[PDB]
Amino acid sequence: SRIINVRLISMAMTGYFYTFTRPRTSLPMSMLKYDPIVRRKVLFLEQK
């Protein structure tokens, strides 16, 4: 209940995602990850 599992959706609209955990009483996650569909580092943002 204290920790939630979020989904970091790629901003290349390729449908790839990364799942990381973070506390509810925190800000949304945002990272620069490697999208294997386009094979390039793009911006991944939390789903909601």
Partner: protein, 54 residues
Amino acid sequence: RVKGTGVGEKVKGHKHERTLVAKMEKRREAMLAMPDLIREWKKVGKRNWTKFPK
């Protein structure tokens, strides 16, 4: 004269095939706007970012 493959008929196509040209464009339109989205994300910062998918 059966559906699709008969004389004077056109194969409908599977949905993945029908939405293929509109699917590759969404990826192409997004990648072209990728450099401008990372510049706005590194300038605004990870904490002050307020745009997220829905």
